[PDB]
Amino acid sequence: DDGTGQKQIWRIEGSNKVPVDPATYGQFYGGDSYIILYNYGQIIYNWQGAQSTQDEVAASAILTAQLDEELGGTPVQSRVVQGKEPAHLMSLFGGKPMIIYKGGTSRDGGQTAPASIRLFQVRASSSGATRAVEVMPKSGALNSNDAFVLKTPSAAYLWVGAGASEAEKTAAQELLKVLRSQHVQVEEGSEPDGFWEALGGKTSYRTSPRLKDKKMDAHPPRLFACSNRIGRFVIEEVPGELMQEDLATDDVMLLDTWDQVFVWVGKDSQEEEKTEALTSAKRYIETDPANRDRRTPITVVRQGFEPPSFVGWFLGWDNNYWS
Ligand SMILES: [Ca+2]
Ligand SMILES: [Ca+2]
């Protein structure tokens, strides 16, 4: 409907279900799971932070079951994972974006504290759904297509890539509010020396003509998963926001960015899987010549050696993820 309805949010901790500060709703901790209750018929969502411990997810289910029962099993349960939130769940916070802090809580380990120099990638969806994810404070994390927010104990910068859309921009400010800091909007390219210092690096980040394009809207990057494990090569499309966790380490991935088609080769994929993936990249291109420049390259990249211009299409990236 509009997410405007009333709602209560809890953050599983160990085995309990402590509430979430009503003012800090739009915010969540990736290293933890949450249980939210909404009212249109009620729908309970069971969010899972990408870096949420096992016990935290397990317990979550045990609790997300009782609540449904307390309400007479009437509510419609719904499980979701970071980055793959439905259009509805993204509206539950009015216009505000969905902040995703790094860290959270755990059994033995308490509630991890922030840093001092923090960086957030603000990417918006086709429809508008904006998310702000906390990343590693390094220039190499920058990305011409989105808007970032670099916050130091002193001042904060609102970096805006050449591809950043209006939504991502405004949502950047919104994050600034939650952070509570006077920012300084800096357009990609003309940034203050006093900025790179916080990142503690020279430059070199995820860029490319295509990442800066303002017409990518005609056809946003589509990530497909090709596997051959049932006996015949079968291709499926990855839903929601593209995420590193989406890259099938046992299969082959296809990243059509229209102007170019990447074929990501999983460290544990098969050889035929790669061979058929290539042929697929070909047919995707030859599917509509009149609109697709016949000479479109099909680049082959391997897990662990992906170029920035490729990683730049994902929301968040851990150089030591598969490590
Ligand atoms: Ca963008
Ligand atoms: Ca496989």
Curated annotation (Swiss-Prot):
Annotated binding of Ca(2+) 8, by residue: D250, D251, E273
UniProt repeat feature Gelsolin-like, residue ranges: 15-90, 131-196, 235-310
Segments for region (Actin-binding, Ca-sensitive): 1-323
Protein residues bound to Ca(2+) 5: G31, D32, E56, T105
Positions of modified residues (N6-acetyllysine): K138
Binding site for Ca(2+) 6: D68, G73, P75
Residues with PTM Phosphothreonine: T296
Modified residues (Phosphotyrosine): Y25, Y157, Y205
PTM description: Phosphorylated on tyrosine residues in vitro.
Positions of Ca(2+) 7 binding: N145, D146, E168
Domain of life of the native organism: Eukaryota
Record remark on domains: Comprises six structurally related gelsolin-like (G1-G6) domains, that, in a calcium-free environment, are packed together to form a compact globular structure in which the putative actin-binding sequences are not sufficiently exposed to enable binding to occur. Binding calcium may release the connections that join the N- and C-terminal halves of gelsolin, enabling each half to bind actin relatively independently. G1 and G4 bind two Ca(2+) in a type I and in a type II manner. G2, G3, G5 and G6 bind only one Ca(2+) in a type II manner.
Family as reported in the entry's similarity comment: Belongs to the villin/gelsolin family.
Protein function: Calcium-regulated, actin-modulating protein that binds to the plus (or barbed) ends of actin monomers or filaments, preventing monomer exchange (end-blocking or capping). It can promote the assembly of monomers into filaments (nucleation) as well as sever filaments already formed. Plays a role in ciliogenesis.
Quaternary structure and partners: Binds to actin and to fibronectin. Identified in a complex composed of ACTA1, COBL, GSN and TMSB4X. Interacts with the inactive form of EIF2AK2/PKR. Interacts with FLII.
UniProt name for this protein: Gelsolin
Organism: Mus musculus
Organism phylogeny: Eukaryota, Metazoa, Chordata, Craniata, Vertebrata
Span covered, complete protein: 439 to 767 of 780
